Each structure stands twice: as C-alpha cells, then as structure tokens.
Amino acid sequence: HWGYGKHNGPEHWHKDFPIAKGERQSPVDIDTHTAKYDPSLKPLSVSYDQATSLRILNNGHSFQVTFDDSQDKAVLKGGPLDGTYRLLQFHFHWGSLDGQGSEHTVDKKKYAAELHLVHWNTKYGDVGKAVQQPDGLAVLGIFLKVGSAKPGLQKVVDVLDSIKTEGKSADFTNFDPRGLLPESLDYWTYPGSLTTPPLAECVTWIVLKEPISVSSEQVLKFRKLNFNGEGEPEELMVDNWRPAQPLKNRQIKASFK
Numbered sequence: 001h002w003g004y005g006k007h008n009g010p011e012h013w014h015k016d017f018p019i020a021k022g023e024r025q026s027p028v029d030i031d032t033h034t035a036k037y038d039p040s041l042k043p044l045s046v047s048y049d050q051a052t053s054l055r056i057l058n059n060g061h062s063f064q065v066t067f068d069d070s071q072d073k074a075v076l077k078g079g080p081l082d083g084t085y086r087l088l089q090f091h092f093h094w095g096s097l098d099g100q101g102s103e104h105t106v107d108k109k110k111y112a113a114e115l116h117l118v119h120w121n122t123k124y125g126d127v128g129k130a131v132q133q134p135d136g137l138a139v140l141g142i143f144l145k146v147g148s149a150k151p152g153l154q155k156v157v158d159v160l161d162s163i164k165t166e167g168k169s170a171d172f173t174n175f176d177p178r179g180l181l182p183e184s185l186d187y188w189t190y191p192g193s194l195t196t197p198p199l200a201e202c203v204t205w206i207v208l209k210e211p212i213s214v215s216s217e218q219v220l221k222f223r224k225l226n227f228n229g230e231g232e233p234e235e236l237m238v239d240n241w242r243p244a245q246p247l248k249n250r251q252i253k254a255s256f257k
C-alpha cells in the first residue's frame with residue numbers, strides 16, 4: 001500500500017506506522033559544522049572478503065542484493081558498534097534527476113543516490129528479532145554522485161533489465177561489495193530508524209563522508225526500473241527516497257577532525 005507517490009508517500013506513512021513521527025527517525029540532514037568530532041570513536045571494521053551474494057530482487061520500492069547471513073562471512077564491527085553485525089542485503093535510493101535521490105543530506109546537499117548496506121547484530125540471532133531492538137541494525141550509508149563510472153557497480157547495472165518489475169529476482173552470486181566502497185571510511189554516526197515502513201527505531205547509522213562516483217549511464221539504468229508489477233501501468237522507480245526528518249534530541253558524531 002505505501003509508496004513514494006502523492007497519495008501513499010512519506011507524508012502518509014504515519015497513518016499505518018505512527019513511529020514515523022517518533023524521536024529517532026531517519027534520514028536526517030547532517031550539519032557538518034554541528035557534528036561533534038568524537039576522538040573515542042573507533043575506525044570502522046568492514047570485513048567483506050568471505051561475502052556470499054545470493055539473489056538480486058525488485059521489491060517494489062528499490063532493488064536489493066541479498067547475502068548469506070547464516071554465518072559471520074561479511075561483517076561490520078568497530079566504529080560506534082558493540083559486537084558483530086552480519087551483512088543481510090544492500091539496496092539504493094535514487095532520484096528522477098541527479099540533484100535528488102539521497103536520503104541523508106550534508107549541509108542540505110542532496111546526492112544523486114544513496115547506497116545502504118544493511119547489517120544486523122548477531123547477539124539477537126535473526127534480523128526479525130534485531131529490528132525490535134534499539135541497537136539491532138547497523139546501516140552503512142554511502143552517497144553516489146554522477147561523474148566517472150564505478151567499475152564495481154557494473155555487474156549490478158547489467159542485470160537490472162532482468163528484474164524490471166516488482167517481484168522479479170535473479171541469481172546474483174559471486175558479487176563482491178568491496179567494489180562499492182570509497183577510499184576513506186571517515187563517517188558520521190547517529191541513532192535512527194529504517195527509512196521505509198515499518199520505520200523501526202533499531203538502526204545505528206554510519207554515513208561515509210566520501211561519496212562514490214557512478215556514471216550517468218549507470219544511474220540511467222536504475223531509473224528504468226519500475227515500481228509496478230508486470231502488466232500494470234508503468235511507473236518508473238525514481239524518487240524512492242524519504243526526506244530528512246527532525247533531529248530532535250540527537251547528536252551526530254564525526255569519526256574525523
């Protein structure tokens with residue numbers, strides 16, 4: 001029922017998901033001058049060498065690459081985190097044009113897209129239990145700007161024609177998510193939420209300062225996806241981003257000076 005349109009988009013979500021007006025909603029604007037450098041923050045540990053990708057799926061609100069999270073193979077540790085977080089999936093949010101698409105903003109700047117690598121805390125045993133906990137999930141957010149191609153994204157772009165409509169999936173084995181990371185792991189962190197329904201307040205956000213560059217041809221392929229199922233009136237999957245929500249009583253911390 002929910003979506004990104006005039007009649008079912010972000011301003012409607014609170015009716016089915018009243019936590020939409022809660023105290024730790026995401027995304028937020030990152031005011032770079034107000035974010036406090038925290039020398040106590042650890043470097044982020046991204047251990048993706050044994051990652052096992054399984055499938056690529058159009059879920060009607062994004063496309064996602066799902067991983068085997070039945071063991072500690074692709075894990076996030078350190079940074080602001082206590083314990084070990086398993087990679088479940090990554091997905092993107094993007095715009096109809098390059099001047100919008102990101103969920104987080106930086107001094108009100110919107111990027112063309114935002115990559116979310118979703119991880120869950122192994123102390124809760126499964127992701128369904130983890131989404132009920134304030135420290136259940138860690139989402140690594142990476143901004144995309146348009147310029148030079150990202151070679152590590154091309155394997156993803158080239159299969160999107162096979163998952164055009166809601167509910168379509170394909171084999172997507174042997175994909176290495178290290179190819180989607182920028183040079184620097186400098187980050188901002190704050191306590192927040194899932195950015196789609198059910199908007200659960202279960203996420204430690206880790207947003208990288210350094211964007212990755214993708215080509216116009218790569219983001220054009222995102223924009224050919226469809227929100228609709230096959231047969232249904234064609235509605236391009238564009239502008240699948242929630243705007244910035246009130247920061248309320250929260251501090252954004254920077255890992256860097």
Ligand SMILES: C[C@@H]1CC(=O)[C@@]2(C)CC[C@H]3[C@@H](CC[C@@H]4C[C@H](OS(N)(=O)=O)CC[C@@]43C)[C@H]12
Binds near residue numbers: 127128
């Ligand atoms: C599988 C877990 C358990 C659960 O209840 C689910 C299904 C809610 C929806 C979640 C999913 C985890 C992966 C995604 C995270 C995304 O949030 S974001 N955009 O902040 O990264 C919201 C959409 C998403 C599919 C959750």
Ligand SMILES: [Zn+2]
Binds near residue numbers: 091092093195
């Ligand atoms: Zn997301």
